[PDB]
Design an enzyme around this catalytic site. Structure first.
Site, PDB file in Angstrom:
ATOM      1  CG  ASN D  29     -40.801 -16.104  26.414  1.00 10.49           C
ATOM      2  OD1 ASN D  29     -41.313 -15.932  27.521  1.00 10.49           O
ATOM      3  ND2 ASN D  29     -40.085 -17.185  26.120  1.00 10.49           N
ATOM      4  CB  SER D  45     -41.336 -20.013  19.170  1.00  9.92           C
ATOM      5  OG  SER D  45     -40.362 -20.974  19.545  1.00  9.92           O
ATOM      6  CB  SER D  74     -43.227 -17.481  23.203  1.00 11.63           C
ATOM      7  OG  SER D  74     -42.555 -18.060  24.314  1.00 11.63           O
ATOM      8  CB  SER D  75     -41.561 -22.840  23.420  1.00 14.16           C
ATOM      9  OG  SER D  75     -40.556 -22.279  24.244  1.00 14.16           O
ATOM     10  CD  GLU D  76     -39.788 -19.770  28.231  1.00 13.88           C
ATOM     11  OE1 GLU D  76     -38.809 -19.091  27.847  1.00 13.88           O
ATOM     12  OE2 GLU D  76     -39.897 -20.183  29.404  1.00 13.88           O
ATOM     13  CG  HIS D  95     -39.162 -15.667  30.385  1.00 17.17           C
ATOM     14  ND1 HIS D  95     -38.535 -16.011  31.566  1.00 17.17           N
ATOM     15  CD2 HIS D  95     -38.800 -16.607  29.479  1.00 17.17           C
ATOM     16  CE1 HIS D  95     -37.831 -17.114  31.379  1.00 17.17           C
ATOM     17  NE2 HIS D  95     -37.969 -17.497  30.121  1.00 17.17           N
ATOM     18  CG  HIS D  97     -33.184 -16.953  29.162  1.00 19.93           C
ATOM     19  ND1 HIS D  97     -33.032 -17.838  28.115  1.00 19.93           N
ATOM     20  CD2 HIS D  97     -34.408 -17.195  29.690  1.00 19.93           C
ATOM     21  CE1 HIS D  97     -34.121 -18.577  28.009  1.00 19.93           C
ATOM     22  NE2 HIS D  97     -34.974 -18.206  28.949  1.00 19.93           N
ATOM     23  CG  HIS D 157     -35.814 -21.040  32.721  1.00 18.85           C
ATOM     24  ND1 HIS D 157     -36.921 -21.763  32.323  1.00 18.85           N
ATOM     25  CD2 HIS D 157     -35.610 -20.105  31.764  1.00 18.85           C
ATOM     26  CE1 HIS D 157     -37.358 -21.290  31.168  1.00 18.85           C
ATOM     27  NE2 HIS D 157     -36.581 -20.284  30.809  1.00 18.85           N
TER      28      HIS D 157
HETATM   29 MN   LIG Z   1     -36.872 -19.052  29.185  1.00 24.34          MN
END
Ligand SMILES: [Mn+2]
Ligand SMILES: [Mn+2]
Ligand SMILES: [Mn+2]
Ligand SMILES: [Mn+2]
Lengths: 207, 207, 207, 207
Positions: D29, D45, D74-76, D95, D97, D157
């Site tokens: 995100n 999200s 976003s959940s973050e 952010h 992955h 993560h």
């Molecule tokens: Mn993540």
């Protein structure tokens, strides 16, 4: 045609398999179950994914008999049909020949909780011991290895993932391949930290 | 032009070599045998694959003499011609400089039955010991290493694959590169499980 | 503009650097020497390669003074200029931040004769010990490490390759990155076989 | 719409995340802070990055309340908001992955000065110990791990990077992923040479 929506989805996601690096050549295969009719759409055997049209997709019943389509269905149809007979929570399956999952599978190893993304499949992913491709023995091994999971590794072969629809099934296949890459790379240089079982339980809820 | 179908196929599959990551730059080369005429179409030496047109492909006879074409033929033509003289089951050859096959070859190792896909080549793939590129010594080593197989590794160099037609030859090259990736990655972190010889025999039939 | 042919080539090959995976972001840089005029075309500092136009390329003399162009020249211009002053066999330079070469360089290791392709650079490729980017100390270390070679590794940094023209310079950069990948992968799982020095001598001739 | 420039940038850089291999699926995100208004633009999200339009971006205030947008943020988001509250030097966050950073993070290791490019983040990059995704505990761990740095690894993560604007934030994310690849590959075959702390200090100035 029968299962037109499903046919188009199989063509679309099959290209996405090639595109995403989840398979080589004509390896792998995809199916989608129409629960209302008891009909299964499945990719045709040995055809190039970017050459495959909706008419090339084959429609089977749960006995494995062809209902519509002139192409030969995937040689791995038995491994698809067993999930639509012996569970009721899976309506789509993605079978891949992706490199990192196939690496872990060829060691005969399970994939442990190396990432929170493992929860797409469950607390871990088991490895089913080897059986010859395109047989009922492989279908049984795959199913048994995937009990209470949404994915399973197939020894010296690849991965299969299942979910309530084709979008989620593909997501499980892609995210578990990624988790296998992380596991492979961490094991190359050390010992990865793993998430505890209660956290995997927690993550199962949050997902 | 002579062997027009073959010429177009060589241009198409040569681009596919670059595209698929099976070679770098102008490395590697492709040939297709017209058994009826005893003529061989082969990629031109040192040309970029996306710049290569059918007219640039060179037509040779089995003595290695140029019959049509003004380009210099591949420097590795002797390694192609030997298969069309000393076997009768191969009508197309794909020679690659692909990274995982070249890795296994540069250790001097054979590629064992790490995957059922190995059966595209045979029960295993041998590694021919080093000989200078573009020589008759390399041609002999490659051929001898590939006896009763459809592919062979070339020490510190790459891979060559052959089959009854160009589609299957490319498939062998691509699937054996993939098998080499699996072997390389499994050996990085452990000891892969291997398929037994009777199963490789079984798989030879099923393929 | 001055050195128009060179300017266009620098834009073209700079995109090819990004495209080929030989660099990340705006890292790396390219130069081409016009020996008749004593002028050097060089990529501009900190610009995106697909946003770079021929007018953005900077023209310098061998004293390092800007002759045409309003952009700041590459911060690594001293490392380019030294080759056009202290040798006479190099007319183009490609400096990369490519992952496998940078891996070998960050161990401080030489790249030995793991492949016949090493002969694009010489019998081996040396690793120059670390010096701060954009300094005369790095320029000196790079040059000294590349004596009687067409490429050198730069500790914890990357690679630079030089040749008689830009096409061959890029080829050296790409093929040496590939050789570094093979070396890295072989060392991951065993000890690669190396080609003997007399064969590297032989290959120097054949290339 | 509010923060139109920011909204478009988030859509553009989100696609660039997928394109650059810095994330899989809808993972990761991006946020951008408008310091004049005290408003934060953030990716929505669970949406596909190539399906995301500027209207889908969500605008929040620093209390975490939605000000404009109907999509779920976003959940973050908590992990984004903390940097805009507790520092004043960061106006954009990326952010990811990405595989090599996530590899180092899943070992629980810091990323040391293996490359001069590490200076994009600082003298090193710390690894924040595991906390459940989408929680305030993760937000706190991320922030604390990133004190006096522009990036931090998140155990099992991924990575988050921050800078004065979105262009530099993305650059930090991409270059630190590359540094993690180098660290991973060097550790696979040996012990990398590291840059000394005074040089990292020097490089902090030069950057
Ligand atoms: Mn993540
Ligand atoms: Mn399969
Ligand atoms: Mn070759
Ligand atoms: Mn550099």
């Amino acid at each position: 045609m029968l299962l037109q929506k499903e046919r188009e989805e199989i063509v679309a996601y099959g290209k996405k398999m090639i595109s995403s690096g989840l398979t080589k050549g004509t390896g792998g295969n995809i199916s989608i179950f129409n629960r209302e009719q008891g009909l299964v759409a499945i990719s045709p055997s040995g055809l190039e994914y970017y050459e495959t049209k909706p008419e090339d997709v084959v429609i089977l019943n749960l006995d494995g008999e062809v209902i519509e389509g002139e192409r030969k269905p995937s040689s791995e149809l038995d491994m698809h049909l067993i999930y639509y007979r012996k569970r009721e929570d899976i309506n789509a399956l993605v079978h891949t020949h992706s490199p990192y999952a196939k690496t872990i599978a060829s060691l005969g190893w399970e994939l442990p909780a190396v990432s929170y993304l493992i929860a797409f499949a469950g607390p871990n992913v088991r490895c089913a011991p080897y059986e010859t491709f395109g047989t009922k023995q492989l279908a049984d091994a795959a199913f048994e290895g995937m009990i209470d999971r949404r994915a399973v590794l197939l020894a010296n072969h690849g991965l299969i993932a299942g979910a309530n629809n084709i979008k989620m099934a593909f997501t499980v296949a892609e995210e578990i391949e990624f988790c296998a890459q992380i596991y492979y790379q961490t094991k190359s240089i050390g010992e990865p930290k793993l998430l505890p079982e209660d956290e995997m339980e927690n993550l199962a809820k949050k997902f």
